[PDB]
Amino acid sequence: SSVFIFPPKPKDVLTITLTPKVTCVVVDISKDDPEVQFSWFVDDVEVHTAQTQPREEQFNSTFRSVSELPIMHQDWLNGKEFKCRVNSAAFPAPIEKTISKTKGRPKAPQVYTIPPPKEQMAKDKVSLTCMITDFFPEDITVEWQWNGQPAENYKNTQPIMDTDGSYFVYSKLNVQKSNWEAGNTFTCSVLHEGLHNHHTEKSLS
Amino acid sequence: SSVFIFPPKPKDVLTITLTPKVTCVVVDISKDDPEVQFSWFVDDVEVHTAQTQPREEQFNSTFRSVSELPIMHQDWLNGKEFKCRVNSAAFPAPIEKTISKTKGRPKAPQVYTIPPPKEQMAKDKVSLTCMITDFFPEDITVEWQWNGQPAENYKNTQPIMDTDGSYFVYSKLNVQKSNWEAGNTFTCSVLHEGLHNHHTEKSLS
Ligand SMILES: [Cl-]
Ligand SMILES: [Mg+2]
Ligand SMILES: [Mg+2]
């Protein structure tokens, strides 16, 4: 069992009413292993407000242990370091994991939308595209809105670093024929620390 | 000299990187009056992180004294009460002022845009309109964006309470002829606690 640590949801970090949290996970544990113990520190000073989930059997019959450290929005943006120190019997020494915002001047992303390619219109299931470029750091949230309501039928590619140090991402929203030309409006909502108001919208029809 | 207290900028309250602040002002002071002393409390417990400006001569030759209490975003949204207690020699007893978010379930505003009325197109200076309705509480920020850059040539009416308990606001963006039909894009950016992502955009051309 190897330990992983995850950044907070970019959306959570930017919305005052949400609660950003750092996540530590010990996956691939043997039903036989003793419960792992977690320990957290914010800038090398231990904190005691984390909550660790019970323990859940995953898809490969083994388990995972999740621990969440709720944090302050500002601490993530100001670059504080978050350390998860996990140990147990099945570990000679404890494993330590670290994570913190990528450092550098934030850069605002360029958000563009793309209506179905000329050649796809011939199908009975098309796809709208949101093309987000030149942002930094990589933390970003991209979602789609049908008219004004959520849309769960979309996929975002993981951010990739272009040659120049910035990142890009594509979001693909699928829509069974119809809708597109004759129908409801489609909006690409992006949240990033580099945007004016930290958020922006672009819509298609 | 009567004392006033002002809510934090709605935009400040909602953007994690901005610093919302409560403002106390003692306007109409006589050049002869002794410097007023301020005192703050958050939920009846005094705080000592406020900063009071020196003292500035206003438009009617008299002066004003401004004191700002930086606060936490959450405290404003969670309904905490902010009290400014000001005294001095020119005051028998001290004056106390209170302010805090209006209480009730937040309601999301409906944001619509209006292109110049048919009858105004005949002029060499038109006006775009952003019509925001059904929001609650009244704290809101409405701004305009020419393409993607700020616009300072706009006016927002103060929010008004409709019959049903909600509020509405109109924002008027003026644009010297041209632009409108043949030109750059105009966006109405609104920030409110009741919106998804706390923010939204509507554009015209
Ligand atoms: Cl926001
Ligand atoms: Mg099983
Ligand atoms: Mg003078």
3-state DSSP of A11-75: HHHHCCCCCCEEEEEEEEECCCCCCCECCEEECCCEECCCEECCCEECCCCCEEEEEEEECCHHH
Instruction: Give the Cα separation of A26 and B100 in Å (integer).
Output: 44
Length of chain A: 205
Contacts with B192 from chain A: Cβ below 8 Å: none
Q: Tell me how far CA of residue B66 lies from CA of B1, B14, B43, B63, B89, in angstroms.
A: 13, 23, 21, 10, 18
DSSP 3-state assignment of B176? coil
Contact across the interface for B16 and A17, Cβ inside 8 Å: no
Peptide bond into A137 cis (omega under 30): yes
Instruction: Give the Cα separation of B141 and B8 in Å (integer).
Output: 11
End-to-end CA distance of chain A: 48
The pair of structure tokens assigned to A108 is: 């605002």
Residue type, B199: H
Q: Tell me how far CA of residue B190 lies from CA of A21, A130, B55, in angstroms.
A: 28, 22, 34
Q: What's the CATH fold of domain B1-100? A: Immunoglobulin-like (2.60.40)
Residue type, A124: D
| Secondary-structure breakdown of chain B: helix, strand, coil percentages, each rounded to the nearest 5 | 10, 45, 45
Per the CB < 8 A criterion, the answer to whether B12 and B20 are in contact is yes
Instruction: Give the Cα separation of B185 and B163 in Å (integer).
Output: 34
* CATH topology agreement for domains B1-100 and B101-205: yes
State phi, psi for B168 to the nearest 5 degrees.
-140, 160
Domain definitions of chain B by residue range: 1-100, 101-205
Residue type, B173: L
Q: Can you give the three-state secondary structure of A100-159, one letter per residue?
A: CCCCCCCECCEEEEECCCCCCCCCCCEEEEEEEEEEECCCCEEEEEECCECCCCEEECCC
How remote is the C-alpha of B194 from its chain's centroid?
A: 16
Select from A13, A15, A73 the Cβ nearest to the Cβ of B198: A15
Q: Which segments of B are annotated as binding site for Mg(2+)?
A: 57
Instruction: Calculate how far, in angstroms, residue B61's C-alpha sits from the geometric centre of ligand 3.
Output: 5
Instruction: Give the Cα separation of B121 and A41 in Å (integer).
Output: 63
Class of domain B101-205: mainly beta
Residue B178, phi-psi category: left (phi > 0), alpha (psi -120 to 50), beta (remainder)? left
> Is residue B197 less than 8 Å (CB to CB) from chain A?
yes
Q: Tell me how far CA of residue A205 lies from CA of A48, B80, B96, B102, in angstroms.
A: 50, 44, 55, 38
Strand partners, A87: A37
Residue of B11, B191, B197, B205 to mutate when probing chain A, most A C-beta within 10 A: B197
Q: Tell me how far CA of residue A179 lies from CA of A94, A156, A174, A204, B125, in angstroms.
A: 54, 21, 10, 11, 38
Contacts with A14 from chain B: Cβ below 8 Å: 16
Contacts with B76 from chain A: Cβ below 8 Å: none
> Is residue B13 less than 8 Å (CB to CB) from chain A?
yes
Residue of B198, B202, B203 to mutate when probing chain A, most A C-beta within 10 A: B198
In terms of Cα–Cα distance, which of A190, A197, A153 is closest to A10? A190
Instruction: Calculate how far, in angstroms, residue B192's C-alpha sits from the geometric centre of ligand 1.
Output: 9
Residue type, B60: N
